[PDB]
Symmetry: D2
Subunit: 345 residues, 4 copies
């Protein structure tokens, strides 16, 4: 197979062969609609096992929907949703959170590496509490792993959870790349979520191997009923649910999801180790997951561009490039990029 030249995002990758085959297997026969079938029930039982707790699960088509739905059930229209200014909900959902929540307001809390600064968060969540002329603190959202591939430690997450419980705020986790942060920390799903104070999680699978299926995992099960209506009302209740369930079931079979995440993180780590010490190349950050950033010589950026590589190079500081690897990124794919970088140095 020729080397895959795309490193723009993990969203360009396909799906593990086991996922597509699960769809084939489940394409025959009849099945109750809207999640009333056995496969769906099986998947829900799997989430309970995986999270070591009775949790409520709602499979939806996209991560944007998962996020907006979660947040809409955790804030009134006159409420505030605290998040990092570089978060996906504040930048790439065309205001989906604002839509689903019926006008809630996002309040940004800056911090290095796309992580909310705990001190600032503590200050913002106590602004004008009770003042009738001001929108009110309602919930907090943190992306795990972050939009730049950094990772909140178990201590940092739990710390945010303190502030949330302290001000009666809900805590949501945008886990579009949940698995990548999970395998980097080597902790349990439970330790990185409810045991740390998370109330709702956007369990991402699409970016880590499936076709199109995300899971809303509710730890604060009292929101289940509201969530059902909100999902349906937003047009996110799939009639032939087995086709979302089949994807996730495969995803959660034989530890496929974790293996896929390990391969993605392993690929970026390989890239960082190969880029360290090359002419006109400075790796930025620790490359904790499947996303790597590095400062490159412009001429080397054009050489990579001319070489047919797909990557972003204008969204941040001058000369800062971003390479994103996926579950399907082979060691070979990475070695091709390294070689082209070397040869272009």
């Amino acid at each position: 197979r020729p080397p895959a030249l795309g490193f723009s995002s993990d969203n360009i990758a396909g799906a593990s062969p086991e996922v597509a085959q699960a769809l084939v297997k489940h394409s025959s026969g009849q099945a109750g609609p809207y999640g009333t079938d056995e496969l769906t029930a099986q998947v829900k039982r799997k989430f309970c096992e995986i999270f070591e707790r009775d949790v409520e699960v709602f499979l939806v088509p996209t991560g944007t929907a998962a996020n907006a739905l979660c947040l809409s059930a955790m804030t009134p229209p006159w409420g505030n949703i605290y998040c990092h200014p570089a978060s996906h909900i504040n930048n790439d959902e065309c205001g989906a959170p604002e839509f689903f929540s019926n006008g809630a307001k996002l309040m940004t809390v800056d911090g290095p590496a796309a992580k909310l600064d705990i001190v600032r968060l503590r200050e913002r969540t106590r602004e004008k509490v009770g003042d009738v002329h001001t929108t009110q603190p309602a919930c907090v959202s943190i992306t795990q792993a972050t939009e730049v591939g950094s990772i909140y430690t178990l201590d940092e997450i739990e710390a945010i959870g303190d502030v949330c419980k302290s001000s009666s705020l809900g805590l949501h986790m945008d886990g579009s790349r949940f698995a990548n942060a999970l395998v980097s920390l080597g902790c349990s799903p439970a330790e990185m979520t409810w045991k740390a104070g998370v109330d709702a999680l956007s369990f991402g699978a699409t970016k880590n191997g499936v076709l199109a299926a995300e899971a809303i995992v509710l730890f604060n099960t009292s929101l289940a009923t509201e969530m059902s209506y909100r999902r349906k009302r937003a047009g996110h209740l799939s009639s032939k649910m087995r086709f979302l369930s089949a994807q996730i079931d495969a995803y959660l079979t034989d530890d496929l999801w974790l293996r896929n995440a390990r391969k993605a993180n392993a690929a970026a780590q390989r890239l960082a180790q190969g880029l360290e010490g090359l002419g006109g190349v400075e790796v930025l950050g620790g490359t904790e997951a499947n996303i790597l950033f590095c400062r490159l010589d412009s001429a080397m950026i054009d050489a990579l561009l001319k070489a047919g590589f797909g990557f972003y190079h204008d969204r941040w500081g001058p000369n800062v490039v971003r390479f994103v690897t996926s579950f399907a990124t082979t060691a070979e794919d990475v070695d091709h990029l390294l070689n082209q970088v070397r040869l272009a140095a």
Copy 2:
């Protein structure tokens, strides 16, 4: 294969083997996200060919989303969406139209067989026009084929189109079962849509053979831009679009969609012909598509229920039963039901 005992709805069926296999074929390699890939472009070209016109296409996860999105772009918040009181948008979307349109109001216009009465429609669309204290006529929605399996004729559709153009109202078609009405009429997609005045269509495929992929087909292309944002904002813009595109492409290959619709309609027609003249059985309607209604003796309803058949029997008048067939309903499946009806008579 044993006989399929479910006739509750076509939404219990799986997917044509060609669809799942298309997903397998397209699960490898990389592809631009959010519909920027070649397969998606191919599918769009196919819609233009099929409809004999440059049309704008937006693939979405569900029919509820397709409907709500279409209607939201055709009415202001203070506008009215005219529809039959038995329509899906007025009953089974938990108010999705109201949600997406930011509060538009559904105005029902009754009529036999789930078809809007043209005279009543003409009267309702001219109520308080221009009155500041009243919501205003904005658009009209007709389900083709209807929720009860009846079909609007080309003349009836076009007639509704006159009223719409007359009052500057948009005309939307809920084509959840588009194909079933199309093959029953034997007309062209164009003749049953834009040539008759339709501005926006919810092109249904899920119920006729795919896993989960519907298509918003815009004939009034001036709404394209607004539709992009609305789709994204509602969380309905799938990142790995090839998995929706692959389904639809297969659906629109070798006339699969039409063949599937023919088989579904053929199955119901077989059932109606077998039920005609049996004890305690009166077939209601002409069974124009893949949905059949009949009045049955209660005892025969329990015998079918005890026989393990799945069907609705309480949603309408007393003793009125509904059997729905799908693209996968075999002549054998139908003959089993007929036999059980006979034996239970």
Copy 3:
């Protein structure tokens, strides 16, 4: 003074001289804004006395705002607001309820004389309860006195309250013409509201004597906090609240409001007694409040129209006219209309 020829509605009348003078008295000095002044506190204490209970009060600019705000706090976006099809919320608020509630859906329940039929209400409020694809029963709204001048008896109101408590539904009262129904029944404010099960009331004063000031009276005080934010968010929290408070205080001084209502009802009753037995004139209904309907000979309608009288005559059945009297309608004003009717018969 010449006779007042307008009988279109009570909304054409001005304000009792005591109201305007209260504004004069309170136009000097300084006062805390947004209802934090003494006059406002005084008014709130008056509502508690008048209703013989601790109630929460929120003065707002219009009856449409009072209605929408009340209902928005009693129903989720996916909820249903039951009301008569001829109700103001379903006809003349350009969808304000739909707006404030973020998309809730009005469900009409017909009945003679603009009064919800209890049997139908009982059936509608138990439709698809718990069904995820359907909007849910949330609250009920009854207009007291109704839009046609009829009145719900204490028994009828309480009966609706049973259904509401039975299905955990909130009960709102549109009291745009609260006082007119109150003095017709001769009951206490408490007996016609909370003692009968009402949770929220749109206490109308504008139509009965003030310039522009309505009062949201909450008996279910647990909604107070939410109501504050909703009122502010909707732009209905007046900064110089004393100018709404001054109007209402005057309104509730020396039983002015009741006296005003008595005069309005007395005027319509005088008109009905004078119209009974005249050529080409049939009085319809019992004229329980300040609104009278009668069937008149077309030629007599033009004679009244040519005589300069203002009234509606096309909104109902053929030849059905509506005369509405106000707190300022003198016996003289009524005698002029009667004379012109006589002379035109």
Copy 4:
């Protein structure tokens, strides 16, 4: 009269005696409702004269409503409303703009003295234009005079207008204190609005002398129709409009509004001139309107507080106090404050 000790805001003042008397005069007789009366027509003609142009006028109860309504007609739900982070729409309307616009997003553009920095504005309004995943630039809002009493010059306003026309963005002016900036500049209403590119103005009168009546002045008259429905739908269409019209008519009679603004600005200017050179007192800014800020010795702040003065002293930097004067602030009121400041120094 004893000295008025309140300087918290101009919203604590009452109304010019001419306003209350206008209400008295107009409290008798009958009048068409919802702005269909002669007084209202008269007022509209006055706005056209005052602005030297045919403009559309919509009188509403509050400034928050005026703002939200204006902005809702200038941005789609997926649009951006650019404003200063210290603006009223971004801080004290409990998200009214977000509510009325159905979820539009406020994008802050910082700058000294509550004035949007033109360079930053130019950069922000061209972010992700056309990108489907991002909310889009839609309109800009500037407060004239600003929330801190500063004033945009005719050149600064027009400059913002260039950017707006350049990117097809609407330009709204929050003129809560319109008159104060107008008399400080000595320009014409037209020069400070449409001649500089303003499309919609929240014409503030309440803070400058009336009881409760603001005016939405539309220079982009093509939005009139939409505005009517939006106003009604939001519950802001007063039935007895003459009571808003009477206030504004008085306000715009014998140059009362301008005289009132001159007195307010004159009072603050007197205060600044008296505070200049006193112990432990530093005046901040040029005091261009009716709002003054100064840094005071804590002990002097308690002495003023103990003296019974009402003012804010915690909302900004340490030791920064704010005194706001109104149309009713006499030279005497100001001399009392100066004396107490002196004696407390």
